[PDB]
Design an enzyme around this catalytic site. Structure first.
Site, short mmCIF file in Angstrom:
data_model
loop_
_atom_site.label_atom_id
_atom_site.label_comp_id
_atom_site.label_asym_id
_atom_site.label_seq_id
_atom_site.Cartn_x
_atom_site.Cartn_y
_atom_site.Cartn_z
N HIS A 184 12.08 -4.98 6.61
CA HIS A 184 12.52 -5.29 5.26
C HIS A 184 14.03 -5.09 5.14
CE1 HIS A 184 12.92 -5.06 0.96
NE2 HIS A 184 13.40 -3.82 1.04
N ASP A 191 15.15 1.17 -5.37
CA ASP A 191 13.80 1.74 -5.48
C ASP A 191 13.60 2.95 -4.54
OD1 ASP A 191 13.86 -0.24 -3.39
OD2 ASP A 191 11.73 -0.69 -3.61
N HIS A 215 18.03 0.55 -0.82
CA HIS A 215 17.86 -0.12 -2.10
C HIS A 215 17.55 0.86 -3.22
CE1 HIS A 215 16.80 -4.08 0.15
NE2 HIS A 215 18.12 -4.02 -0.03
N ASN A 245 11.65 -9.30 -1.59
CA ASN A 245 13.08 -9.50 -1.54
C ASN A 245 13.52 -9.48 -0.08
OD1 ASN A 245 15.93 -9.50 -1.89
ND2 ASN A 245 15.93 -7.25 -2.24
N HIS A 263 15.14 3.70 2.60
CA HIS A 263 16.17 2.69 2.83
C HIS A 263 17.15 2.70 1.68
CE1 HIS A 263 13.32 -0.10 0.83
NE2 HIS A 263 14.34 -0.89 0.52
C1 NZR Z 1 5.86 -8.64 -3.57
C2 NZR Z 1 7.16 -7.95 -3.92
C3 NZR Z 1 7.34 -6.62 -3.62
C4 NZR Z 1 8.54 -5.96 -3.96
C5 NZR Z 1 9.61 -6.62 -4.53
C6 NZR Z 1 10.90 -5.97 -4.81
C7 NZR Z 1 11.39 -5.97 -6.14
C8 NZR Z 1 12.59 -5.43 -6.49
C9 NZR Z 1 13.34 -4.78 -5.51
C10 NZR Z 1 12.88 -4.74 -4.17
S1 NZR Z 1 13.92 -4.03 -2.93
N1 NZR Z 1 13.31 -2.77 -2.20
O1 NZR Z 1 15.14 -3.69 -3.65
O2 NZR Z 1 14.09 -5.11 -1.96
C11 NZR Z 1 11.68 -5.33 -3.81
C12 NZR Z 1 11.15 -5.36 -2.45
N2 NZR Z 1 10.84 -6.48 -1.78
N3 NZR Z 1 10.26 -6.08 -0.66
N4 NZR Z 1 10.21 -4.75 -0.68
N5 NZR Z 1 10.78 -4.27 -1.78
C13 NZR Z 1 9.43 -8.00 -4.80
C14 NZR Z 1 8.20 -8.62 -4.50
ZN ZN Z 2 14.21 -2.68 -0.38
ZN ZN Z 3 10.96 -2.25 -2.21
#
Ligand code: NZR
Ligand code: ZN
Ligand code: ZN
Length: 230
Positions: A148, A87, A85, A179, A83
């Site tokens: 997500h 990460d 983002h 997030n 995706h």
């Molecule tokens: C329990 C948890 C897991 C992951 C995060 C997270 C932390 C930073 C960035 C992201 S992302 N891919 O940018 O939206 C995420 C995330 N949230 N859900 N999926 N990835 C926060 C909490």
């Molecule tokens: Zn994400």
């Molecule tokens: Zn993530």
């Protein structure tokens, strides 16, 4: 023995053998002042490697390439980001400079562009409709529908029955949907059910963040999403 967030300094990358020719990569990164672990996948493709997702940033992704060179010693020739983002795409410029061909769906590429994130070079057609699947070297890419994020893909390794859920799938210890800024909480359980229906033989399920487990991670994720909703 799977590595945890407090076991990996930011800037270091660990590899974990999941199955013959299948590894996860684990890195850590700081975001909005908290440190998180993050997973990706490495799949052997003959005498080459397919990478799924960056290691969340330029420095981590350079460290990922160095760890792969040391531990596996096969070149990474292609990468898919699941995706838009950071990460998943943060570090794509490092990969592209290292000779890795970078790919993502057109949905992911448009969202990465709009967000100001790094953009994979090549576009993956045939994934725009929920339930779509395409072959990409040793894996199948599946678009389960919005979860997500609206573009999130999952990856199956048929030779090993490994399902990499990315951020559409949460680990068992998760108590929150993470997030949700770009999520579809209402469609997410339906998207999980499409994954459950399409991959009933999955032996290992790897979340985007945290510990792999079995098929229970899918139902748990639908449950977490429902608890967030109300
Ligand atoms: C329990 C948890 C897991 C992951 C995060 C997270 C932390 C930073 C960035 C992201 S992302 N891919 O940018 O939206 C995420 C995330 N949230 N859900 N999926 N990835 C926060 C909490
Ligand atoms: Zn994400
Ligand atoms: Zn993530």
């Amino acid at each position: 023995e799977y590595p945890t967030v407090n076991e990996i300094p930011v800037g270091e990358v660990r590899l974990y053998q999941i199955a013959d020719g299948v590894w996860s990569h684990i890195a850590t990164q700081s975001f909005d002042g908290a440190v998180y672990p993050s997973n990706g996948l490495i799949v052997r493709d003959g005498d080459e490697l397919l990478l799924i997702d960056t290691a969340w940033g330029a420095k981590n992704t350079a460290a990922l390439l160095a760890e792969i060179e040391k531990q596996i010693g096969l070149p990474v020739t292609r990468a898919v980001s699941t995706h838009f983002h950071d990460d998943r795409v943060g570090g794509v410029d490092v990969l592209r400079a290292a000779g890795v061909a970078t790919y993502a769906s057109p949905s992911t590429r448009r969202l990465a562009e709009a967000e100001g994130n790094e953009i994979p070079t090549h576009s993956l057609e045939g994934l725009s409709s929920s339930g779509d699947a395409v072959r990409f070297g040793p894996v199948e890419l599946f678009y389960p529908g919005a979860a997500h994020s609206t573009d999130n893909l999952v990856v199956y390794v048929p030779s090993a029955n490994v399902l990499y859920g990315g951020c559409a799938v949460h680990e068992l210890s998760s108590t929150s949907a993470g997030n949700v800024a770009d999520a579809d909480l209402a469609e997410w359980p339906t998207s999980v059910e499409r994954i459950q229906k399409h991959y009933p033989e999955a032996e290992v399920v790897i979340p985007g963040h945290g510990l792999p487990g079995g098929l229970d991670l899918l139902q748990h994720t639908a449950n977490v999403v429902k608890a967030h909703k109300n």
